[PDB]
Amino acid sequence: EIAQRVLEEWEPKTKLGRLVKEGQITDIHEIFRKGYQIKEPEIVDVLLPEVNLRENQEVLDIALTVRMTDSGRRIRFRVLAAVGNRDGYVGLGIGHGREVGIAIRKAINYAKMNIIEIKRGCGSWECRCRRPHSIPFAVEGKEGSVRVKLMPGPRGLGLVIGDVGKKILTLAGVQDVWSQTLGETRTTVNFAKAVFNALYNTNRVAIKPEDIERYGIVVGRAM
RNA sequence: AUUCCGGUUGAUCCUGCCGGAGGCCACUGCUAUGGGGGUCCGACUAAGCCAUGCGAGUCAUGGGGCGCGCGCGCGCACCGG
Ligand SMILES: [Zn+2]
């Protein structure tokens, strides 16, 4: 139904859009680990239809910024938004706007275009299951003054982290994690970007064939 | 729950302190139906001050006396352990 509904009224402008409209590329994993540029949010609307439901579109922050022209001062809105399916795909965006609606829509489109793919597993000394309910190993991210360290935890231990990270990890599909932070967490933008980069850096650790079985590692969607 | 939230600017990122939010102990305001268990109740200030009465005795299988009874027993103080 809605698949073709959206596909019909979309006229592509890029080669990736054209391939996704035709049907050469059918799965979401086919666009990622090649140096493709992603300039249309319709690609992601079509391949990941879960990122249009309101349940998957957290608005994280609204800020009121000021510019001086006295002259009189001019008021603007900055919006920070996250989107994602709860099975391995999350993105984050910022939007300028003169009105909050404009800001929000721009932020969500930039979030769709800034989409990544993560890994999941179990690497805690206290569960040793082989199911993907957490992260498989410990990772570190940074932005500005904020430093985030994410550690694997056991089942039933729900997201021991600040709220911004709670939302981002929920959307990425993580259920259990321990955290250490350093710096100024009250800058929501930088706290969020640090968590996002920590999740991205799950793909920069080198592993071996046995680690996959040992930790139940999963790249993207499960099952 | 190996956690963060507010505050310095016309707006921003930092440093850095104040404050919030949890637990235990003591005093206190308002209010209060019941049963059970426990190693709780002048320690912090005065190891400051007092009245009344109690908190350490026992032995007739160590000895003499006296009394109350019926050579047998019951009691009183005393010597002695
Ligand atoms: Zn586990």
UniProtKB/Swiss-Prot annotation:
GO CC list: cytosolic small ribosomal subunit
Note on cofactor: Binds 1 Zn(2+) ion per subunit.
Entry annotated with the keyword rRNA processing: no
UniProt-listed InterPro entries: Ribosomal_Su5_D2-typ_SF, Ribosomal_uS5, Ribosomal_uS5_arc, Ribosomal_uS5_C, Ribosomal_uS5_euk/arc, Ribosomal_uS5_N, Ribosomal_uS5_N_CS, Ribsml_uS5_D2-typ_fold_subgr
Cofactors named for this entry: Zn(2+)
Source organism, top-level taxon: Archaea
Boundaries of every S5 DRBM domain copy: 55-118
Record key words, sorted: Metal-binding, Ribonucleoprotein, Ribosomal protein, RNA-binding, rRNA-binding, Zinc
Annotated positions binding Zn(2+): C122, C127, C129, H133
GO biological process terms held by the UniProt record: translation
Family classification: Belongs to the universal ribosomal protein uS5 family.
Domain remark in the UniProt entry: The N-terminal domain interacts with the head of the 30S subunit; the C-terminal domain interacts with the body and contacts protein S4. The interaction surface between S4 and S5 is involved in control of translational fidelity.
Description of how the protein assembles with itself and partners: Part of the 30S ribosomal subunit. Contacts protein S4.
Known role: With S4 and S12 plays an important role in translational accuracy.
Name of the protein described by the UniProt record: Small ribosomal subunit protein uS5
